[PDB]
Amino acid sequence: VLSEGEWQLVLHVWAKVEADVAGHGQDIFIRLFKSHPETLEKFDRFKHLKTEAEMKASEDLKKVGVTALTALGAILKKKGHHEAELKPLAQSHATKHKIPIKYLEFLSEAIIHVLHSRHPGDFGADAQGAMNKALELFRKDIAAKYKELGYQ
Numbered sequence: 472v473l474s475e476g477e478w479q480l481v482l483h484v485w486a487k488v489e490a491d492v493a494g495h496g497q498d499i500f501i502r503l504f505k506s507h508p509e510t511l512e513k514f515d516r517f518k519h520l521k522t523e524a525e526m527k528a529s530e531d532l533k534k535v536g537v538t539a540l541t542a543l544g545a546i547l548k549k550k551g552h553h554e555a556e557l558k559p560l561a562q563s564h565a566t567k568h569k570i571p572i573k574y575l576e577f578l579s580e581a582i583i584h585v586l587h588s589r590h591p592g593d594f595g596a597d598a599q600g601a602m603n604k605a606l607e608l609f610r611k612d613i614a615a616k617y618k619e620l621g622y623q
């Protein structure tokens with residue numbers, strides 16, 4: 472369970488993401504696909520993209536990044552009281568998209584890496600620790616919902 476101070480460190484870096492969620496989403500998903508290329512295979516609409524240049528030019532990828540980061544932002548703003556938000560997300564990601572928890576870990580790693588590079592003013596060590604806590608909580612709770620839904 473995060474403290475309010477930890478939540479505020481999370482939200483204060485998220486405020487910078489929200490200056491340009493589209494550009495942050497491109498950096499984050501491109502980092503994910505470069506570090507873990509198997510994750511790109513889950514996106515039937517753009518799994519054919521071959522290079523970072525093609526990824527940066529893809530409007531479909533840009534929209535996926537906006538949608539995902541905005542949904543994550545809504546979860547973070549609930550400061551752990553995210554039961555309602557996790558229901559539809561767990562159901563689609565477990566049952567339709569088939570996204571292992573390990574891939575959510577990979578995405579969390581990409582988020583941390585991009586925030587560390589882009590936001591040293593709001594992503595020092597304590598802030599990064601708070602974001603890790605928040606993402607670990609998200610993954611813990613969504614893993615429990617995956618299990619309820621029949622996806623180990």
Ligand code: HEM
Binds near residue numbers: 513559563564
């Ligand atoms: C913080 C974690 C994530 C959030 C908040 C998130 C959020 C979303 C949302 C809101 C949608 C659209 C509605 C839906 O189908 O549920 C979506 C679609 C999708 N997500 Fe995620 N997502 C996350 C992680 C991932 C990861 C790691 C992958 C794959 C490695 C993934 C794969 C997909 C796919 C394949 C779709 C459909 C995309 C399309 O229409 O082209 N998601 N996600």
